[PDB]
Short mmCIF file of C-alpha atoms in Angstrom, two decimals:
data_model
loop_
_atom_site.label_atom_id
_atom_site.label_comp_id
_atom_site.label_asym_id
_atom_site.label_seq_id
_atom_site.Cartn_x
_atom_site.Cartn_y
_atom_site.Cartn_z
CA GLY A 1 -10.39 -23.39 16.97
CA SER A 2 -8.84 -26.85 17.13
CA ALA A 3 -7.58 -26.85 13.53
CA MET A 4 -4.04 -28.01 12.73
CA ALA A 5 -1.46 -25.29 13.38
CA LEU A 6 0.60 -23.72 10.60
CA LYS A 7 4.36 -24.26 11.05
CA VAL A 8 5.83 -20.75 11.12
CA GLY A 9 9.59 -20.40 10.73
CA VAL A 10 11.01 -17.23 12.29
CA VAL A 11 14.25 -15.49 11.36
CA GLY A 12 15.52 -11.92 11.62
CA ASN A 13 16.66 -9.22 14.04
CA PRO A 14 15.12 -6.32 16.01
CA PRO A 15 12.97 -4.38 15.50
CA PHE A 16 11.40 -6.94 13.14
CA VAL A 17 12.04 -10.05 15.25
CA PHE A 18 12.92 -10.49 18.94
CA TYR A 19 13.57 -13.82 20.68
CA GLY A 20 12.17 -14.36 24.16
CA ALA A 21 8.99 -16.28 22.69
CA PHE A 22 8.66 -14.24 19.47
CA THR A 23 7.82 -10.54 19.06
CA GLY A 24 8.55 -7.63 16.71
CA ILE A 25 7.17 -5.98 13.56
CA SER A 26 7.22 -9.18 11.50
CA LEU A 27 5.38 -11.08 14.26
CA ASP A 28 2.77 -8.30 14.56
CA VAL A 29 2.12 -8.59 10.80
CA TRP A 30 1.87 -12.37 10.86
CA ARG A 31 -0.30 -12.43 13.98
CA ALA A 32 -2.76 -9.92 12.51
CA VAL A 33 -3.00 -12.18 9.43
CA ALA A 34 -3.42 -15.38 11.46
CA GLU A 35 -5.95 -13.75 13.81
CA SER A 36 -8.08 -12.47 10.92
CA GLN A 37 -8.42 -16.07 9.72
CA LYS A 38 -8.61 -17.61 13.21
CA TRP A 39 -5.50 -19.69 12.41
CA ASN A 40 -3.32 -21.54 14.94
CA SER A 41 0.46 -21.12 14.74
CA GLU A 42 3.53 -23.07 15.84
CA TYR A 43 6.69 -20.92 15.72
CA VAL A 44 10.09 -22.44 15.01
CA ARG A 45 13.20 -20.23 15.10
CA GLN A 46 15.34 -20.75 12.00
CA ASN A 47 19.14 -20.68 11.91
CA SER A 48 19.23 -18.57 8.74
CA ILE A 49 17.09 -17.30 5.89
CA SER A 50 18.29 -19.93 3.41
CA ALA A 51 17.81 -22.70 6.00
CA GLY A 52 14.26 -21.47 6.49
CA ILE A 53 13.59 -21.21 2.75
CA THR A 54 14.70 -24.84 2.26
CA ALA A 55 12.41 -25.89 5.13
CA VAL A 56 9.47 -24.25 3.30
CA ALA A 57 10.40 -25.86 -0.04
CA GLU A 58 10.69 -29.25 1.68
CA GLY A 59 7.31 -28.81 3.37
CA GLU A 60 8.88 -28.71 6.85
CA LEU A 61 7.37 -25.23 7.33
CA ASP A 62 4.18 -23.68 5.96
CA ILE A 63 5.65 -20.16 5.96
CA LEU A 64 8.85 -18.30 6.80
CA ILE A 65 8.37 -14.88 8.39
CA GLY A 66 10.77 -12.05 9.20
CA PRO A 67 12.58 -9.11 7.51
CA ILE A 68 13.33 -11.29 4.47
CA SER A 69 14.55 -9.32 1.45
CA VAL A 70 12.91 -10.32 -1.83
CA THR A 71 15.89 -10.89 -4.12
CA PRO A 72 16.20 -12.51 -7.61
CA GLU A 73 18.38 -15.31 -6.22
CA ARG A 74 15.85 -16.19 -3.53
CA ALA A 75 12.84 -15.90 -5.83
CA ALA A 76 14.67 -18.37 -8.09
CA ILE A 77 14.75 -21.12 -5.45
CA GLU A 78 12.62 -24.08 -6.58
CA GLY A 79 9.47 -24.83 -4.59
CA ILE A 80 8.96 -21.42 -2.98
CA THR A 81 7.15 -18.14 -3.68
CA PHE A 82 7.26 -14.77 -1.91
CA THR A 83 4.19 -12.96 -0.62
CA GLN A 84 3.65 -9.35 -1.66
CA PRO A 85 6.21 -7.11 0.13
CA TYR A 86 5.08 -5.56 3.42
CA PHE A 87 8.01 -3.20 4.11
CA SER A 88 10.55 -1.24 2.11
CA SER A 89 13.91 -1.32 3.86
CA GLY A 90 17.30 0.15 3.11
CA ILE A 91 20.67 -1.53 3.63
CA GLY A 92 23.00 0.78 5.52
CA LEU A 93 26.26 1.17 7.40
CA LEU A 94 27.14 1.57 11.08
CA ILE A 95 30.44 3.41 11.66
CA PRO A 96 32.29 5.10 14.55
CA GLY A 97 31.23 8.72 15.01
CA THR A 98 34.69 9.89 13.94
CA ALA A 99 34.61 8.02 10.62
CA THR A 100 31.69 10.12 9.30
CA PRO A 101 33.80 12.04 6.74
CA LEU A 102 35.16 8.77 5.34
CA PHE A 103 31.77 7.28 4.33
CA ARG A 104 29.93 9.67 1.98
CA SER A 105 28.98 7.18 -0.77
CA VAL A 106 29.04 3.52 -1.84
CA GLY A 107 32.27 4.25 -3.72
CA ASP A 108 34.00 4.84 -0.38
CA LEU A 109 33.25 1.21 0.54
CA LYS A 110 36.04 -0.25 -1.64
CA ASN A 111 38.85 -1.84 0.39
CA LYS A 112 37.34 -0.74 3.70
CA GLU A 113 37.13 -3.58 6.25
CA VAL A 114 33.36 -4.07 6.24
CA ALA A 115 31.75 -6.52 8.66
CA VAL A 116 28.61 -8.39 7.53
CA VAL A 117 26.37 -11.07 8.98
CA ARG A 118 26.44 -14.42 7.19
CA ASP A 119 23.50 -15.27 4.90
CA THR A 120 22.15 -11.72 4.59
CA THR A 121 21.93 -9.58 1.45
CA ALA A 122 24.69 -7.36 2.89
CA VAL A 123 27.27 -10.07 2.12
CA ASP A 124 26.51 -9.74 -1.60
CA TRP A 125 26.30 -5.95 -1.55
CA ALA A 126 29.61 -5.72 0.35
CA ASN A 127 31.29 -7.98 -2.20
CA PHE A 128 29.69 -6.06 -5.10
CA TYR A 129 31.11 -2.77 -3.77
CA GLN A 130 34.54 -4.36 -3.37
CA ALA A 131 34.79 -3.87 0.37
CA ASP A 132 37.12 -6.01 2.47
CA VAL A 133 34.34 -8.36 3.55
CA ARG A 134 34.50 -10.03 6.98
CA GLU A 135 31.62 -12.44 7.69
CA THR A 136 30.29 -12.94 11.22
CA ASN A 137 27.67 -15.21 12.82
CA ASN A 138 25.35 -12.44 13.99
CA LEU A 139 24.88 -8.67 14.20
CA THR A 140 26.18 -8.57 17.80
CA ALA A 141 29.38 -10.28 16.60
CA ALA A 142 29.73 -7.84 13.68
CA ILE A 143 29.24 -4.88 16.01
CA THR A 144 31.54 -6.34 18.66
CA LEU A 145 34.23 -6.30 15.95
CA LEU A 146 33.48 -2.63 15.27
CA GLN A 147 33.44 -1.92 19.03
CA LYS A 148 36.96 -3.34 19.09
CA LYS A 149 38.83 -2.07 16.03
CA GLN A 150 39.10 -4.50 13.14
CA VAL A 151 36.39 -3.26 10.80
CA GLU A 152 35.74 0.31 9.69
CA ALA A 153 31.99 -0.36 9.32
CA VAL A 154 29.15 -2.88 9.65
CA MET A 155 26.79 -3.36 6.69
CA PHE A 156 23.28 -4.46 7.62
CA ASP A 157 19.59 -3.51 7.28
CA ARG A 158 19.19 0.15 8.26
CA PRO A 159 16.22 -0.25 10.68
CA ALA A 160 18.08 -2.89 12.72
CA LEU A 161 21.19 -0.70 12.92
CA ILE A 162 19.18 2.35 14.01
CA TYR A 163 17.39 0.26 16.62
CA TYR A 164 20.77 -0.90 17.93
CA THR A 165 22.19 2.61 18.25
CA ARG A 166 19.06 3.56 20.21
CA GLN A 167 19.71 0.85 22.81
CA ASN A 168 23.35 1.86 23.15
CA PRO A 169 23.64 5.69 22.84
CA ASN A 170 26.69 5.42 25.14
CA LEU A 171 28.65 3.77 22.30
CA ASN A 172 28.66 6.77 19.94
CA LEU A 173 28.19 4.66 16.80
CA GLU A 174 26.43 6.24 13.83
CA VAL A 175 24.28 5.00 10.96
CA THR A 176 25.48 6.85 7.85
CA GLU A 177 23.21 8.54 5.31
CA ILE A 178 24.49 6.00 2.74
CA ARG A 179 21.87 3.61 1.35
CA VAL A 180 23.67 0.65 -0.24
CA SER A 181 20.27 -0.46 -1.59
CA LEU A 182 16.51 -0.46 -1.06
CA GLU A 183 14.97 -3.89 -0.59
CA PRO A 184 11.39 -5.00 -0.02
CA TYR A 185 10.59 -7.47 2.80
CA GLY A 186 8.19 -10.37 2.24
CA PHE A 187 7.29 -13.75 3.74
CA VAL A 188 8.05 -17.11 2.07
CA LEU A 189 5.39 -19.70 1.22
CA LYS A 190 5.51 -22.99 -0.70
CA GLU A 191 4.97 -22.42 -4.42
CA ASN A 192 1.29 -22.67 -5.39
CA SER A 193 0.33 -22.70 -1.70
CA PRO A 194 -3.45 -22.66 -1.02
CA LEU A 195 -2.76 -20.01 1.66
CA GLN A 196 -1.09 -17.55 -0.74
CA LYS A 197 -4.15 -15.59 -1.85
CA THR A 198 -5.51 -15.21 1.68
CA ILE A 199 -2.15 -14.08 3.06
CA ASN A 200 -1.54 -11.58 0.24
CA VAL A 201 -4.99 -9.98 0.60
CA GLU A 202 -4.57 -9.69 4.39
CA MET A 203 -1.05 -8.29 4.23
CA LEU A 204 -2.20 -5.80 1.58
CA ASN A 205 -5.15 -4.82 3.83
CA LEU A 206 -2.74 -4.22 6.72
CA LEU A 207 -0.45 -2.22 4.44
CA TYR A 208 -3.14 0.05 2.93
CA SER A 209 -4.90 0.61 6.27
CA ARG A 210 -1.57 1.92 7.62
CA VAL A 211 -1.63 -0.80 10.30
CA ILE A 212 1.87 -2.02 9.39
CA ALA A 213 3.06 1.60 9.66
CA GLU A 214 1.66 1.65 13.22
CA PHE A 215 3.51 -1.61 14.04
CA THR A 216 6.75 -0.07 12.76
CA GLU A 217 6.12 3.20 14.63
CA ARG A 218 5.65 1.22 17.86
CA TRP A 219 9.12 -0.38 17.62
CA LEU A 220 11.02 2.42 15.84
CA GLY A 221 9.09 5.72 15.88
CA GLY B 1 11.72 -18.87 -32.15
CA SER B 2 8.45 -20.23 -33.53
CA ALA B 3 6.92 -20.99 -30.13
CA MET B 4 3.32 -20.00 -29.37
CA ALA B 5 3.03 -16.33 -28.40
CA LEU B 6 1.92 -15.20 -24.94
CA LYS B 7 -1.28 -13.13 -25.00
CA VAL B 8 -0.32 -9.84 -23.35
CA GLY B 9 -3.12 -7.50 -22.29
CA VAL B 10 -2.10 -3.84 -22.12
CA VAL B 11 -3.74 -1.11 -20.05
CA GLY B 12 -2.55 2.18 -18.58
CA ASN B 13 -1.47 5.72 -19.42
CA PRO B 14 1.78 7.60 -20.18
CA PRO B 15 4.56 7.41 -19.23
CA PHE B 16 3.90 3.73 -18.45
CA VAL B 17 1.85 2.90 -21.55
CA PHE B 18 1.46 4.70 -24.89
CA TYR B 19 -0.79 3.57 -27.77
CA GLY B 20 0.52 3.84 -31.32
CA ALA B 21 1.63 0.01 -31.30
CA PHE B 22 2.63 -0.18 -27.61
CA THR B 23 5.45 1.66 -25.81
CA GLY B 24 6.26 3.07 -22.36
CA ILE B 25 7.86 2.02 -19.06
CA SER B 26 5.59 -0.99 -18.57
CA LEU B 27 6.32 -2.21 -22.12
CA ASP B 28 10.07 -1.77 -21.60
CA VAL B 29 9.85 -3.95 -18.46
CA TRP B 30 7.78 -6.64 -20.16
CA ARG B 31 9.92 -6.66 -23.30
CA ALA B 32 13.14 -7.06 -21.30
CA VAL B 33 11.50 -10.04 -19.55
CA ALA B 34 10.22 -11.60 -22.78
CA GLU B 35 13.55 -11.02 -24.57
CA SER B 36 15.54 -12.65 -21.77
CA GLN B 37 13.46 -15.80 -22.28
CA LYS B 38 13.23 -15.48 -26.08
CA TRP B 39 9.41 -15.37 -25.77
CA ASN B 40 6.97 -14.24 -28.48
CA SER B 41 4.23 -11.77 -27.55
CA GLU B 42 0.81 -10.78 -28.90
CA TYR B 43 -0.40 -7.48 -27.40
CA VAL B 44 -4.09 -6.77 -26.89
CA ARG B 45 -5.18 -3.37 -25.56
CA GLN B 46 -7.66 -3.75 -22.69
CA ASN B 47 -10.61 -1.46 -22.00
CA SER B 48 -9.90 -1.32 -18.27
CA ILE B 49 -7.88 -2.96 -15.50
CA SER B 50 -10.79 -5.07 -14.23
CA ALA B 51 -11.68 -6.13 -17.79
CA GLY B 52 -8.07 -7.22 -18.24
CA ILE B 53 -7.96 -9.04 -14.90
CA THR B 54 -11.09 -11.03 -15.83
CA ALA B 55 -9.48 -11.90 -19.18
CA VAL B 56 -6.47 -13.33 -17.30
CA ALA B 57 -8.67 -15.29 -14.87
CA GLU B 58 -10.67 -16.68 -17.79
CA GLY B 59 -7.49 -17.70 -19.63
CA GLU B 60 -8.14 -15.21 -22.45
CA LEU B 61 -4.79 -13.56 -21.64
CA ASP B 62 -1.57 -14.99 -20.23
CA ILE B 63 -0.61 -11.73 -18.52
CA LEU B 64 -1.88 -8.19 -18.00
CA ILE B 65 0.80 -5.48 -18.04
CA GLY B 66 0.73 -1.79 -17.20
CA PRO B 67 0.82 0.58 -14.16
CA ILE B 68 -1.54 -1.74 -12.26
CA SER B 69 -1.78 -0.95 -8.54
CA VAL B 70 -1.58 -4.01 -6.29
CA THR B 71 -4.61 -3.58 -4.03
CA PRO B 72 -6.36 -5.97 -1.56
CA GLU B 73 -9.54 -5.96 -3.66
CA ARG B 74 -7.67 -6.95 -6.82
CA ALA B 75 -5.49 -9.52 -5.10
CA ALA B 76 -8.75 -11.06 -3.85
CA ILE B 77 -10.06 -11.76 -7.36
CA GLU B 78 -10.34 -15.52 -7.94
CA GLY B 79 -8.01 -17.07 -10.50
CA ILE B 80 -5.32 -14.39 -10.57
CA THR B 81 -2.04 -13.55 -8.83
CA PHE B 82 0.17 -10.45 -8.96
CA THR B 83 3.87 -10.52 -9.81
CA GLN B 84 6.30 -8.83 -7.43
CA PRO B 85 5.90 -5.03 -7.70
CA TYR B 86 8.22 -3.26 -10.14
CA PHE B 87 7.44 0.40 -9.32
CA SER B 88 6.32 2.40 -6.31
CA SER B 89 3.90 5.11 -7.40
CA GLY B 90 2.00 7.82 -5.59
CA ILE B 91 -1.57 8.92 -6.25
CA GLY B 92 -1.73 12.70 -6.60
CA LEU B 93 -3.77 15.71 -7.62
CA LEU B 94 -3.66 18.07 -10.61
CA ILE B 95 -5.06 21.54 -9.84
CA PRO B 96 -5.06 25.03 -11.42
CA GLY B 97 -1.98 27.05 -10.45
CA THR B 98 -4.16 29.47 -8.48
CA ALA B 99 -5.73 26.73 -6.32
CA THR B 100 -2.37 25.85 -4.69
CA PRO B 101 -3.26 27.33 -1.28
CA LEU B 102 -6.51 25.33 -1.21
CA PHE B 103 -4.89 21.86 -1.46
CA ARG B 104 -2.38 21.38 1.38
CA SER B 105 -3.54 17.96 2.63
CA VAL B 106 -5.94 15.06 2.04
CA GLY B 107 -8.32 16.69 4.53
CA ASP B 108 -8.83 19.54 2.05
CA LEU B 109 -10.28 17.02 -0.42
CA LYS B 110 -13.67 16.78 1.32
CA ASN B 111 -16.53 18.26 -0.73
CA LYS B 112 -14.18 19.50 -3.45
CA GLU B 113 -15.33 18.53 -6.96
CA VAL B 114 -12.66 15.93 -7.73
CA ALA B 115 -12.51 14.32 -11.18
CA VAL B 116 -11.33 10.70 -11.44
CA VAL B 117 -10.96 8.15 -14.22
CA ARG B 118 -13.30 5.16 -14.03
CA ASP B 119 -11.85 1.85 -12.79
CA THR B 120 -8.71 3.32 -11.21
CA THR B 121 -7.73 3.31 -7.53
CA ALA B 122 -8.34 7.08 -7.46
CA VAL B 123 -12.11 6.46 -7.53
CA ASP B 124 -11.88 4.65 -4.18
CA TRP B 125 -9.43 7.11 -2.65
CA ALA B 126 -11.60 10.06 -3.74
CA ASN B 127 -14.67 8.45 -2.18
CA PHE B 128 -12.70 7.57 0.99
CA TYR B 129 -11.63 11.21 1.41
CA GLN B 130 -15.23 12.36 0.90
CA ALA B 131 -14.56 14.43 -2.19
CA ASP B 132 -17.35 15.27 -4.62
CA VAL B 133 -16.42 12.47 -7.01
CA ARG B 134 -17.02 12.89 -10.75
CA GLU B 135 -16.10 9.83 -12.85
CA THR B 136 -14.82 10.19 -16.41
CA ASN B 137 -13.89 7.76 -19.20
CA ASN B 138 -10.22 8.74 -19.42
CA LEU B 139 -7.56 11.10 -18.08
CA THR B 140 -7.98 13.48 -21.05
CA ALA B 141 -11.70 13.73 -20.22
CA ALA B 142 -10.95 14.35 -16.52
CA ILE B 143 -8.43 17.05 -17.42
CA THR B 144 -10.72 18.57 -20.07
CA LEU B 145 -13.21 19.06 -17.21
CA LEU B 146 -10.53 20.81 -15.17
CA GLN B 147 -9.50 22.86 -18.23
CA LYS B 148 -13.10 24.04 -18.35
CA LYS B 149 -14.28 24.73 -14.79
CA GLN B 150 -16.38 22.01 -13.20
CA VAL B 151 -13.87 20.24 -11.01
CA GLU B 152 -11.38 21.79 -8.60
CA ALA B 153 -8.89 18.93 -9.12
CA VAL B 154 -8.13 15.66 -10.91
CA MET B 155 -7.01 12.66 -8.83
CA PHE B 156 -4.77 10.20 -10.66
CA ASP B 157 -1.36 8.49 -10.52
CA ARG B 158 1.30 11.14 -9.90
CA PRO B 159 3.76 10.11 -12.68
CA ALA B 160 1.03 10.30 -15.34
CA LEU B 161 -0.07 13.74 -14.11
CA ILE B 162 3.50 15.07 -14.10
CA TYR B 163 4.05 13.68 -17.58
CA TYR B 164 0.89 15.48 -18.74
CA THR B 165 1.94 18.85 -17.32
CA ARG B 166 5.26 18.45 -19.14
CA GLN B 167 3.52 18.10 -22.51
CA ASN B 168 1.32 21.12 -21.83
CA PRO B 169 3.35 23.76 -19.89
CA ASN B 170 1.14 26.38 -21.59
CA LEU B 171 -1.82 25.23 -19.46
CA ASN B 172 -0.39 26.27 -16.07
CA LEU B 173 -1.76 23.23 -14.24
CA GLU B 174 0.12 21.98 -11.18
CA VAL B 175 0.62 18.63 -9.48
CA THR B 176 0.32 19.29 -5.73
CA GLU B 177 2.73 17.99 -3.09
CA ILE B 178 -0.18 15.95 -1.68
CA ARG B 179 0.22 12.16 -1.85
CA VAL B 180 -3.21 10.56 -1.41
CA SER B 181 -1.41 7.20 -1.20
CA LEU B 182 1.63 5.16 -2.25
CA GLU B 183 0.85 2.12 -4.35
CA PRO B 184 3.08 -0.54 -5.88
CA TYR B 185 2.64 -1.50 -9.56
CA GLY B 186 2.71 -5.15 -10.65
CA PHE B 187 1.62 -7.34 -13.57
CA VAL B 188 -1.25 -9.87 -13.39
CA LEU B 189 -0.85 -13.59 -14.13
CA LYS B 190 -3.20 -16.56 -13.80
CA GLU B 191 -3.01 -18.08 -10.31
CA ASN B 192 -0.41 -20.87 -10.12
CA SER B 193 0.88 -19.90 -13.57
CA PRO B 194 3.98 -21.85 -14.74
CA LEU B 195 5.44 -18.50 -15.90
CA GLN B 196 5.23 -16.85 -12.45
CA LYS B 197 8.65 -17.83 -11.09
CA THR B 198 10.48 -16.89 -14.29
CA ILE B 199 8.72 -13.52 -14.54
CA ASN B 200 9.32 -12.66 -10.86
CA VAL B 201 13.05 -13.49 -11.03
CA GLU B 202 13.46 -11.44 -14.22
CA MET B 203 11.51 -8.44 -12.96
CA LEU B 204 13.51 -8.56 -9.71
CA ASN B 205 16.76 -8.71 -11.74
CA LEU B 206 15.66 -5.64 -13.71
CA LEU B 207 14.72 -3.88 -10.47
CA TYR B 208 17.97 -4.60 -8.57
CA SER B 209 20.19 -3.85 -11.58
CA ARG B 210 18.57 -0.39 -11.73
CA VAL B 211 17.39 -1.13 -15.28
CA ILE B 212 13.77 -0.25 -14.45
CA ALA B 213 15.05 3.04 -12.98
CA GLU B 214 16.72 3.75 -16.35
CA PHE B 215 13.44 2.99 -18.18
CA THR B 216 11.62 5.43 -15.90
CA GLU B 217 14.36 8.07 -16.28
CA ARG B 218 14.03 7.81 -20.07
CA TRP B 219 10.31 8.71 -20.00
CA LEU B 220 10.23 11.00 -16.94
CA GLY B 221 13.73 12.09 -15.87
#
């Protein structure tokens, strides 16, 4: 169709989002939704989740997609609304194989030099657990600090950490059994958006038909 | 305060909803939300979920609370919108203790006389798995049919079934390990409701603070 394209902001990390142009679990979900409605899309990579949320509130974007945790603080932002969640993720920790005995619970996080990526929920969880928080620009930067020896762990979404370890088995890094939290992922629309109902129904259809589970299995099974 | 009360429709079964006047997990969640905003409530028991959803769409109710599964078909109903989910429930099966070997998977459901409560997601799941569906007016009626000997199982939300077995250990009924599905519970508001953002933030606060987990532990821990 020749209808005006929806402006789709993209933010996140593998396996949910990859940057060529754009691929990953989140993109598979959005594309299935867009395709079912014969919609045209224009993808714009966003610097951060909050930058993307502001762009949706300001009408600069029609929707923000990616592994975006639905949190009270974000849901409180004026002008935006979250879609129904499409994935239930856990926030975990990546540590050196030898540090396994040291990280058995969230209580062990206190005072430990924990690396986190700026503008992610991990920053807040790391501060809440009284870790020695060290913010970085990206996951690669946070892991490069662990690869060296400045931080005793990296706090980030569990699926992304697992994916990373699978691309670098040679590194001997391990994702602990510790779950700092369980957070649902959703997309961000403008409040009272006329697309909301259609997107929710479609995402729920994908969820219940186990199609999203297949997408996830393709990138992390 | 003397502000106009919100019309709160109530539907569901224990441990989420009990009928005196109204108590249970769902009522604890709603009350915490209402209390945080100093809101006044007027509770009206609903005959069924779809009856309650229509009452919200028609403006007869401001919100419908209870263990309401967020499904594509319901999200598609004109005039309504679901809040963010507050609980992740599983749909299970209640069978006689002796029938344990017979129910090891959803595939074993085909042709088995399965009892379901009218207007619940179990009706659709039972039909989808090709069981010999037998609709009843309520859970007590569906279980009374199992207590006799007409159905080989009762399909209903797992927490409600477990709660039931705990009030009647003398019956020797068992909730199988089979999970027909995993469904999130949410409340129903009028589409583009001015209360939406406030309710979502509050429910998310309750969720993340583990307060909802405490409510659930009180009625089913």
